[PDB]
Design an enzyme around this catalytic site. Structure first.
Site, PDB file in Angstrom:
ATOM      1  N   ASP A   1      82.949  11.688 -19.509  1.00  0.00           N
ATOM      2  CA  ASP A   1      81.968  12.539 -18.845  1.00  0.00           C
ATOM      3  C   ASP A   1      82.207  12.655 -17.340  1.00  0.00           C
ATOM      4  O   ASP A   1      81.923  11.729 -16.576  1.00  0.00           O
ATOM      5  CB  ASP A   1      80.557  11.997 -19.105  1.00  0.00           C
ATOM      6  CG  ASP A   1      79.474  12.896 -18.537  1.00  0.00           C
ATOM      7  OD1 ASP A   1      79.802  13.992 -18.040  1.00  0.00           O
ATOM      8  OD2 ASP A   1      78.291  12.497 -18.583  1.00  0.00           O
ATOM      9  N   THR A   2      82.720  13.805 -16.916  1.00  0.00           N
ATOM     10  CA  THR A   2      82.994  14.035 -15.503  1.00  0.00           C
ATOM     11  C   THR A   2      81.705  14.173 -14.709  1.00  0.00           C
ATOM     12  O   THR A   2      81.719  14.115 -13.482  1.00  0.00           O
ATOM     13  CB  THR A   2      83.845  15.300 -15.302  1.00  0.00           C
ATOM     14  OG1 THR A   2      83.163  16.437 -15.843  1.00  0.00           O
ATOM     15  CG2 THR A   2      85.186  15.139 -16.010  1.00  0.00           C
ATOM     16  N   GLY A   3      80.595  14.352 -15.422  1.00  0.00           N
ATOM     17  CA  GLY A   3      79.296  14.432 -14.776  1.00  0.00           C
ATOM     18  C   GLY A   3      78.550  13.103 -14.733  1.00  0.00           C
ATOM     19  O   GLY A   3      77.354  13.061 -14.419  1.00  0.00           O
TER      20      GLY A   3
HETATM   21  C1  LIG Z   1      74.260  10.290 -10.791  1.00  0.00           C
HETATM   22  O1  LIG Z   1      73.701  10.435 -12.129  1.00  0.00           O
HETATM   23  C2  LIG Z   1      74.507  10.406 -13.188  1.00  0.00           C
HETATM   24  O2  LIG Z   1      75.699  10.339 -13.072  1.00  0.00           O
HETATM   25  N1  LIG Z   1      73.859  10.468 -14.369  1.00  0.00           N
HETATM   26  C3  LIG Z   1      74.619  10.588 -15.619  1.00  0.00           C
HETATM   27  C4  LIG Z   1      74.130  11.775 -16.446  1.00  0.00           C
HETATM   28  O3  LIG Z   1      73.058  11.728 -17.060  1.00  0.00           O
HETATM   29  N2  LIG Z   1      74.971  12.847 -16.413  1.00  0.00           N
HETATM   30  C5  LIG Z   1      74.639  14.187 -16.929  1.00  0.00           C
HETATM   31  C6  LIG Z   1      74.683  15.194 -15.768  1.00  0.00           C
HETATM   32  C7  LIG Z   1      73.554  14.866 -14.794  1.00  0.00           C
HETATM   33  C8  LIG Z   1      73.821  14.079 -13.596  1.00  0.00           C
HETATM   34  C9  LIG Z   1      72.704  13.693 -12.736  1.00  0.00           C
HETATM   35  C10 LIG Z   1      71.366  14.132 -13.119  1.00  0.00           C
HETATM   36  C11 LIG Z   1      71.111  14.992 -14.273  1.00  0.00           C
HETATM   37  C12 LIG Z   1      72.225  15.343 -15.139  1.00  0.00           C
HETATM   38  C13 LIG Z   1      75.670  14.558 -18.013  1.00  0.00           C
HETATM   39  O4  LIG Z   1      76.998  14.420 -17.462  1.00  0.00           O
HETATM   40  C14 LIG Z   1      75.558  13.623 -19.222  1.00  0.00           C
HETATM   41  N3  LIG Z   1      74.280  13.889 -19.894  1.00  0.00           N
HETATM   42  C15 LIG Z   1      73.840  12.871 -20.884  1.00  0.00           C
HETATM   43  C16 LIG Z   1      74.671  12.748 -22.146  1.00  0.00           C
HETATM   44  C17 LIG Z   1      75.888  11.952 -22.127  1.00  0.00           C
HETATM   45  C18 LIG Z   1      76.632  11.785 -23.361  1.00  0.00           C
HETATM   46  C19 LIG Z   1      76.152  12.403 -24.607  1.00  0.00           C
HETATM   47  C20 LIG Z   1      76.934  12.093 -25.881  1.00  0.00           C
HETATM   48  C21 LIG Z   1      76.892  12.886 -27.106  1.00  0.00           C
HETATM   49  C22 LIG Z   1      77.693  12.448 -28.240  1.00  0.00           C
HETATM   50  C23 LIG Z   1      78.538  11.264 -28.230  1.00  0.00           C
HETATM   51  C24 LIG Z   1      78.580  10.484 -27.013  1.00  0.00           C
HETATM   52  N4  LIG Z   1      77.803  10.918 -25.931  1.00  0.00           N
HETATM   53  C25 LIG Z   1      74.939  13.248 -24.584  1.00  0.00           C
HETATM   54  C26 LIG Z   1      74.192  13.419 -23.347  1.00  0.00           C
HETATM   55  N5  LIG Z   1      74.296  15.193 -20.430  1.00  0.00           N
HETATM   56  C27 LIG Z   1      73.173  15.889 -20.571  1.00  0.00           C
HETATM   57  O5  LIG Z   1      72.065  15.521 -20.186  1.00  0.00           O
HETATM   58  C28 LIG Z   1      73.356  17.226 -21.277  1.00  0.00           C
HETATM   59  N6  LIG Z   1      72.823  17.109 -22.643  1.00  0.00           N
HETATM   60  C29 LIG Z   1      73.619  17.430 -23.680  1.00  0.00           C
HETATM   61  O6  LIG Z   1      74.693  17.957 -23.596  1.00  0.00           O
HETATM   62  O7  LIG Z   1      73.110  17.132 -24.867  1.00  0.00           O
HETATM   63  C30 LIG Z   1      73.797  17.613 -26.064  1.00  0.00           C
HETATM   64  C31 LIG Z   1      72.679  18.373 -20.524  1.00  0.00           C
HETATM   65  C32 LIG Z   1      73.074  18.344 -19.018  1.00  0.00           C
HETATM   66  C33 LIG Z   1      73.099  19.741 -21.141  1.00  0.00           C
HETATM   67  C34 LIG Z   1      71.128  18.289 -20.651  1.00  0.00           C
HETATM   68  C35 LIG Z   1      74.600   9.247 -16.382  1.00  0.00           C
HETATM   69  C36 LIG Z   1      73.153   8.741 -16.494  1.00  0.00           C
HETATM   70  C37 LIG Z   1      75.207   9.440 -17.788  1.00  0.00           C
HETATM   71  C38 LIG Z   1      75.377   8.138 -15.604  1.00  0.00           C
END
Ligand SMILES: COC(=O)N[C@H](C(=O)N[C@@H](Cc1ccccc1)[C@@H](O)CN(Cc1ccc(-c2ccccn2)cc1)NC(=O)[C@@H](NC(=O)OC)C(C)(C)C)C(C)(C)C
Lengths: 99, 99
Positions: free
Chosen positions: A25-27
């Site tokens: 996850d690059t995010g």
């Molecule tokens: C500085 O904050 C972060 O880096 N926060 C990260 C984070 O939540 N990253 C988000 C992007 C982000 C950054 C800061 C604030 C708000 C959002 C995503 O990189 C990862 N995240 C959380 C995430 C990570 C892994 C997985 C996953 C799915 C299948 C197998 C393994 N992992 C699902 C959701 N993805 C989602 O929430 C997505 N949800 C999604 O695609 O759901 C289908 C959204 C965006 C479209 C809502 C972590 C908590 C993971 C460290």
């Protein structure tokens, strides 16, 4: 490898000596893994995602092997149903985004 | 380009006549942008991740330039903690993860 983005970029990694699946996850600043016992001392951390904040345990100098590359650094253990590999470890294996 | 991951991979995007900064996010299925005005009708959607869910409005066939690359696709608008470009648009610009 070159991983396309048609589907979620989930790969096999080695942690604790066992093979697990995690999304590259690059995010993600940090690497967050579902509940499990890890070696050593830990400190509390709060991390935030799309829906708000959760509390996790921060372990240091944890080795995760990725595609034959040993990354070593901070791993967060939390209540998530999956494993996320974040930038902190992906930088160590030389991962880039390309277009 | 080739973008390393030592810092958050944030790029300039053009959408709805505005310039915004957004995170290239391989951990996002969808593209999620802070509240803004977009043309056309929309549908409700609930999206989730760390911390829980937020409610967003789904807009289709939106024109968006990402670091100089054209994409036309679904943009979700809502109270996101961070502007993110998800896989749905990164595939259009030919983005891959490489190591
Ligand atoms: C500085 O904050 C972060 O880096 N926060 C990260 C984070 O939540 N990253 C988000 C992007 C982000 C950054 C800061 C604030 C708000 C959002 C995503 O990189 C990862 N995240 C959380 C995430 C990570 C892994 C997985 C996953 C799915 C299948 C197998 C393994 N992992 C699902 C959701 N993805 C989602 O929430 C997505 N949800 C999604 O695609 O759901 C289908 C959204 C965006 C479209 C809502 C972590 C908590 C993971 C460290």
């Amino acid at each position: 490898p070159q991983i396309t983005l048609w589907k979620r970029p989930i790969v096999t990694v080695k942690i604790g000596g066992q093979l697990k699946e995690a999304l590259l996850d690059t995010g993600a600043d940090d690497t967050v893994i579902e509940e499990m016992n890890l070696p050593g001392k830990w400190k509390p951390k709060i991390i935030g995602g799309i829906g708000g904040f959760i509390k996790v345990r921060q372990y240091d100098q944890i080795i995760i092997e990725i595609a034959g590359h040993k990354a070593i650094g901070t791993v967060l253990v939390g209540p998530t149903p999956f494993n996320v590999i974040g930038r902190n470890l992906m930088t160590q294996i030389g991962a880039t985004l390309n277009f």
